[PDB]
């Protein structure tokens, strides 16, 4: 089998930048190399076929290059919609094989997270479950830290987090943080605090609520 290696798994650049993605093959595939774009919604489309030829419908800013075992994809004049993951693929010998992929992050201005906190709904409490949810929405860069506090003390266990892919439109990232405990234990406390630590500020964004004060 021919192995397909992409030098990097991730890359980031500014709008208008010229971006290059590199691809190495384990043996001579005679320019039989294709490039694919997968957007955040999961849709895949062909960009370049046979090293350098532009697929119908793909704008001129995309281009390809290379020979032998070393090949490249280039995006000049970076545009918002170019947020996607890019794959190479060799067509010399069976089995057809893909590179592991390169994700393209498009830089933007620093942005502080929007922080929302939600109490358990009445529906969930009825069935004995107690999930406390905190949203950290639309911030940049993607790195962020969440800390939970229950009546003043830090809770690490029982937390489930979830991150969005880079937003195709505003180029931001968002995060969800849920602390699940039992109904019996949730009722044994009053204040639940959600702290978001982001490089945009030295002080964490704090959002809390009271169970009885409702």
């Amino acid at each position: 089998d021919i192995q397909m290696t992409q030098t990097t798994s991730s890359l980031s650049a500014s709008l208008g930048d010229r971006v290059t993605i590199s691809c190495r093959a384990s043996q001579d595939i005679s320019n039989y190399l294709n490039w694919y774009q997968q957007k955040p919604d999961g849709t895949v489309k062909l960009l370049i076929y046979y090293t350098s030829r532009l697929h119908s419908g793909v704008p001129s800013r995309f281009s390809g290059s290379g020979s032998g075992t070393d090949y490249s994809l280039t995006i000049s004049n970076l545009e918002q919609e170019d947020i996607a993951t890019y794959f190479c693929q060799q067509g010399n010998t069976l089995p057809r094989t893909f590179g592991g992929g390169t994700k393209l992050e498009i830089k933007r201005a620093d942005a502080a997270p929007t922080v929302s906190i939600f109490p358990p709904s009445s529906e969930q409490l009825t069935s004995g479950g107690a999930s406390v949810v905190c949203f950290l929405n639309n911030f940049y860069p993607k790195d962020i830290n969440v800390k939970w506090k229950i009546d003043g003390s830090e809770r690490q266990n029982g937390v489930l987090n979830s991150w969005t892919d880079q937003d195709s439109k505003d180029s931001t990232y968002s995060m969800s943080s849920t602390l699940t405990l039992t109904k019996d234990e949730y009722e044994r406390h009053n204040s639940y605090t959600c702290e978001a630590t982001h490089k945009t500020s030295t002080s964490p964004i704090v959002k809390s609520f009271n169970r009885n004060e409702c």
């Binding site: 076929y49 046979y50 067509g91 529906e123 969800s176």
Partner: protein, 215 residues
């Protein structure tokens, strides 16, 4: 325009079988060689099978051969992928692709989960803010299986300030939340509702976001 539509994906027990279908339009189907490419949950793309235009034969990687059967009905413009002796290393999004010297057109894909775990309906809990020109609501879709679910707001109408968080899998059950931000003016002035569809359990529940009746 060339169009590829996959169907037939689902939750399957290990060792079991499942036939996928792909409806092709916008080109002479009998003229092109067709292939299946799957994307694992690890986002790894793997060639699965290809079949000739005719197709006087078919080609598989060893990792799938003897169990998978790619086939073609040129009269009815469909491609098939008969799977058998299914493994957990078969669970992936499966894409119908048009082929030749490259996969120049891709379908949206259909998902396959190969698990011994049981189908479970989702519980949908409203996330209204406790008691700004924008306001953020949410829904908590707890304890469903398998993937995927669909979440929309006001039947698609609200799409601007929407992002649905990826599901988190824990103890054979998925949980995700969706966040929607609407101006403070239409809430609660105008009805905002989350729509959760779960085709695997044929469960679809609507949850109106009602302000926290906090007395």
């Amino acid at each position: 325009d060339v169009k590829l539509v996959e169907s037939g994906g689902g939750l399957v027990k290990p060792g079991g079988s499942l036939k996928l279908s792909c409806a092709a339009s916008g080109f002479t189907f009998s003229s092109y060689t067709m292939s299946w490419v799957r994307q694992t949950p690890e986002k790894r793309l793997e060639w699965v099978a290809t079949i000739s235009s005719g197709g006087s034969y078919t080609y598989y990687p060893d990792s799938v051969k003897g169990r998978f059967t790619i086939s073609r009905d040129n009269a009815k413009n469909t491609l098939y992928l008969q799977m058998s002796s299914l493994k957990s290393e078969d669970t992936a999004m499966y894409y119908c692709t048009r082929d030749g010297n490259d996969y120049d057109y891709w379908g949206q894909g259909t998902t396959l989960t190969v698990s011994s775990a049981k189908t479970t309906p989702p519980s949908v809990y409203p996330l209204a803010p406790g008691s700004n020109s924008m306001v953020t609501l949410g829904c908590l879709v707890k304890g469903y299986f398998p993937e995927p679910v669909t979440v929309t707001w006001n039947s698609g109408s609200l799409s601007s300030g929407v992002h649905t968080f990826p599901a988190v899998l824990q103890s054979d059950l998925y949980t995700l939340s969706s966040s929607v931000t609407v101006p403070s003016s239409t809430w609660p002035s105008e009805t905002v509702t989350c729509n959760v569809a779960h085709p695997a359990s044929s469960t679809k529940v609507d949850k109106k976001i009602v302000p926290r009746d906090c007395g």
